[PDB]
Design a binder for these strands. Sequence first.
DNA 1: GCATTAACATGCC
DNA 2: GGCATGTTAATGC
DNA 3: GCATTAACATGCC
DNA 4: GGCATGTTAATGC
Lengths: 225, 225
Amino acid sequence: DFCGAIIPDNFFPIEKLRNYTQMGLIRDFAKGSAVIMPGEEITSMIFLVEGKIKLDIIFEDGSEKLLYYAGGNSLIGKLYPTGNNIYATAMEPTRTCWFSEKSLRTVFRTDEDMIFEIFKNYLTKVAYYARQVAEMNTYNPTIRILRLFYELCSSQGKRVGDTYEITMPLSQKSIGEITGVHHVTVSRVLASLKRENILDKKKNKIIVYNLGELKHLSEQTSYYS
Amino acid sequence: DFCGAIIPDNFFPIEKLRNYTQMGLIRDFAKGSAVIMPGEEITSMIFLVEGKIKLDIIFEDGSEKLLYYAGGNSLIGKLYPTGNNIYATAMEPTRTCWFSEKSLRTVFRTDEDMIFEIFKNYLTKVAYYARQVAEMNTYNPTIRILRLFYELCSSQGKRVGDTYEITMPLSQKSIGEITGVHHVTVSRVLASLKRENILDKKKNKIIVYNLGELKHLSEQTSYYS
DNA sequence: GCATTAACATGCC
DNA sequence: GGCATGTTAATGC
DNA sequence: GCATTAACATGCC
DNA sequence: GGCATGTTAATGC
Ligand SMILES: O=C(O)Cc1ccc(O)c(Cl)c1
Ligand SMILES: O=C(O)Cc1ccc(O)c(Cl)c1
């Protein structure tokens, strides 16, 4: 029914795969440990039973960038070699379940629906990243930040009297990483939005005091203002 | 064994799915016709038996951008709604095969390997677009153009005496669309590369006269030179 | 560091 | 011959 | 239009 | 208390 993500965190979780972790291999990591080491070739799907993984790509010159965050019931779909150098670290004590190709056949023979759940999980990732490429080719950095707050507000902002609240803990550093904008530009833009009384990004909530202005500004070509 | 793409054209073709098009629905399009209309909700996988599709996303303000090109044995993995407005046009007379969820079950009951072929096709797309996001966040437009020619040369350039040839018909307009660089910047960069005798992009071949210089320049922060 | 604009020139079922 | 692709330099976001 | 740099200030298992 | 996150303005790619 719907394969969408506004942010690259907890893409299409598959809670029913917890009924089949006995067909796969349990593997616990300590906080701070590598689930996937730089240069490690992975050929398993990795189901996250409990915890939190940060998953990054590393370029040849050593540059490192965020791809996504993974939480409980997330799926790392690295069953085959891809050409990318991936580094995935446990942000907390984390339980995984490693599903090889053979082990997946065993799961599908028991439950043919899990096939389509995995397709949904992949589709969601492709829809996210393909749009993000096209969005970066269409809107300027500062506009992409406004567009993110508008879309989170539309999709998950709760009306609370005069305002909308987005119940979400989200740092400026991550906003920058997700939107591809320098963290100092992120600080500047939020300063503006705050002092103009449009939006306040707090520790655990973003509060939108003025959605129609937020939206209007997101429709311009810059908000380096 | 390998889920890679340097360019968003002909991602992981699955030639064996042509053995199962009788389980799905044949649908022929004329050149210039919409395979997916703007705003059309698609819930089928669409296998391209013969021809060529150009597949674009359209934003709310009407901006339109390339996602990818599809050729024979390519797969459009839109089995479920995604939230994106997609517009896909037949660039030539094109035969498709539409596979619903029910129809895919029928295919998998006959050949369990087709499951994993589809996973490979999805993985390849996710690896492409996820890297492209991270690359646009890491390298400047002009550098991304150099990096593309270097990687195509590495991956598919054939040594021909003094040179490498990449046997590929690729317009400046598409290079721009793929790399997210204005077509006039693309023209400028190629002018430079040509007159410095590094590389010549012709109608049906790119010729690299100097791979080590190409590579060296791709390692700098700009080539607006 | 490059997008944009503009005015112009060459390619092409 | 008409519309799509490519060219070059200047201006400032 | 914004990344970068820099020098500084506030947050935090 | 130490290292990570956030702040603000200036400079020019
Ligand atoms: O491994 C890669 O190159 C990309 C990637 C990373 C994480 C995932 O869950 C997927 Cl499906 C792909
Ligand atoms: O439909 C989308 O939002 C993205 C998309 C487009 C084409 C494909 O083949 C896939 Cl797998 C996804």
